[PDB]
Scaffold this active site. Structure first.
Site, PDB file in Angstrom:
ATOM      1  N   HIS A 173      38.432  45.531  44.288  1.00 30.43           N
ATOM      2  CA  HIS A 173      38.251  44.957  45.623  1.00 30.43           C
ATOM      3  C   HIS A 173      39.550  44.843  46.464  1.00 30.43           C
ATOM      4  CE1 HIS A 173      38.941  40.837  43.778  1.00 30.43           C
ATOM      5  NE2 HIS A 173      39.533  40.659  44.947  1.00 30.43           N
ATOM      6  N   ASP A 186      35.175  45.547  38.403  1.00 30.03           N
ATOM      7  CA  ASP A 186      36.164  45.264  39.420  1.00 30.03           C
ATOM      8  C   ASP A 186      37.559  45.492  38.881  1.00 30.03           C
ATOM      9  OD1 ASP A 186      37.210  44.463  41.870  1.00 30.03           O
ATOM     10  OD2 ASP A 186      36.878  42.320  41.508  1.00 30.03           O
ATOM     11  N   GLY A 205      44.620  35.456  47.153  1.00 35.70           N
ATOM     12  CA  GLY A 205      45.955  35.974  46.964  1.00 35.70           C
ATOM     13  C   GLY A 205      46.156  36.295  45.498  1.00 35.70           C
ATOM     14  N   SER A 252      43.848  37.467  43.452  1.00 33.93           N
ATOM     15  CA  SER A 252      42.953  38.602  43.172  1.00 33.93           C
ATOM     16  C   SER A 252      43.721  39.809  42.549  1.00 33.93           C
ATOM     17  CB  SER A 252      42.170  38.915  44.462  1.00 33.93           C
ATOM     18  OG  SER A 252      41.735  40.234  44.532  1.00 33.93           O
ATOM     19  N   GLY A 253      43.140  40.330  41.483  1.00 36.37           N
ATOM     20  CA  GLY A 253      43.705  41.421  40.687  1.00 36.37           C
ATOM     21  C   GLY A 253      44.787  41.090  39.686  1.00 36.37           C
TER      22      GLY A 253
END
Ligand SMILES: COc1ccc(Cl)cc1C[C@@H]1CN/C(=N\N(C)C)CN(CC(=O)Nc2cccc(C(=O)O)c2)C1=O
Ligand SMILES: [Cl-]
Length: 224
Positions: free
Chosen positions: A41, A83, A174, A176-177
């Site tokens: 994403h 994801d 922020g 994310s990942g």
């Protein structure tokens, strides 16, 4: 990262941030000199990658452009299953004390396990507050059976759940990942949860990395 604390210095040498300009977009982890793993994403046309410093904007940090990225082919925009995405650096990271590869897992760690998730994401929610300093927070893995009570049909068996009961401790915009590591290995990539962040008893959800090592290795090998 909500209700966390600054990461001890130099202990997240595999953490990177993906930036858009000088602005934080996602977290990620260094797999090797050429590749960053992060969530699907986070896909963008171009990335500026920050490595080798707990502080965003540090003189000593490396900034490497990444013009190509590869999402897991089974990624769903609608449901966020699968994801994850590999990001190819335009040039090789210089490894060092502050820049190491992450330890990819060889095992799925079980529910109950103690983990740390790290990120430069907002420290508050809904009102946002961004830290220069890399924040860290400990959570425990939560079983599919327990996590499915909260989220039901939304969950896949390749998503992994973690939190602390009656606790705001969580990730946020922020983060994310970014890495969830447990017993030395990379066990999750920050994927999703509920808004606002840090609602007690809503676990953060993670791409369960132990289910995608073949893909991660095949893909780097294929795109040598
Ligand atoms: C509400 O957010 C939660 C809840 C739980 C977890 Cl574990 C992690 C997050 C952070 C989210 C995760 N997911 C998200 N979308 N999903 C549905 C794929 C959104 N997201 C990306 C994001 O908001 N990035 C971002 C980057 C820079 C600035 C801002 C900003 O709001 O200012 C936001 C997450 O990071
Ligand atoms: Cl793609």
């Amino acid at each position: 990262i909500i209700d966390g604390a600054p990461c001890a210095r130099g202990s997240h040498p595999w953490q990177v941030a993906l930036l858009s300009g000088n602005q934080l977009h996602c977290g990620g982890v260094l797999v090797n000199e050429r590749w960053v793993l992060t969530a699907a994403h986070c896909k963008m046309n171009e990335y500026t990658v920050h490595l080798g410093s707990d502080t965003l904007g540090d003189r000593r940090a490396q900034r490497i452009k990444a013009s190509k990225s590869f999402r897991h082919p089974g990624y769903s925009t609608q449901t966020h299953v699968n994801d994850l995405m590999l990001v190819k650096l335009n040039s090789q990271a210089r490894l060092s004390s502050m820049v190491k590869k992450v330890r990819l897992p060889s095992r799925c760690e079980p529910p109950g396990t103690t983990c740390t998730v790290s990120g430069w994401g907002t420290t508050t929610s809904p009102d946002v507050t961004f830290p220069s300093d890399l924040m860290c927070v400990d959570v425990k893995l939560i079983s599919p059976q327990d996590c499915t009570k909260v989220y039901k049909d939304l969950l896949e068996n390749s998503m992994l759940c973690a939190g602390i009961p009656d606790s705001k401790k969580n990730a946020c915009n922020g983060d994310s990942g970014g890495p969830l590591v447990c017993r030395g290995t990379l066990q999750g990539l920050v994927s999703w949860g509920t808004f606002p962040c840090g609602q007690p008893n809503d676990p953060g959800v993670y791409t369960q990395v132990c289910k995608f090592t073949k893909w991660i290795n095949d893909t780097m090998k294929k795109h040598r």
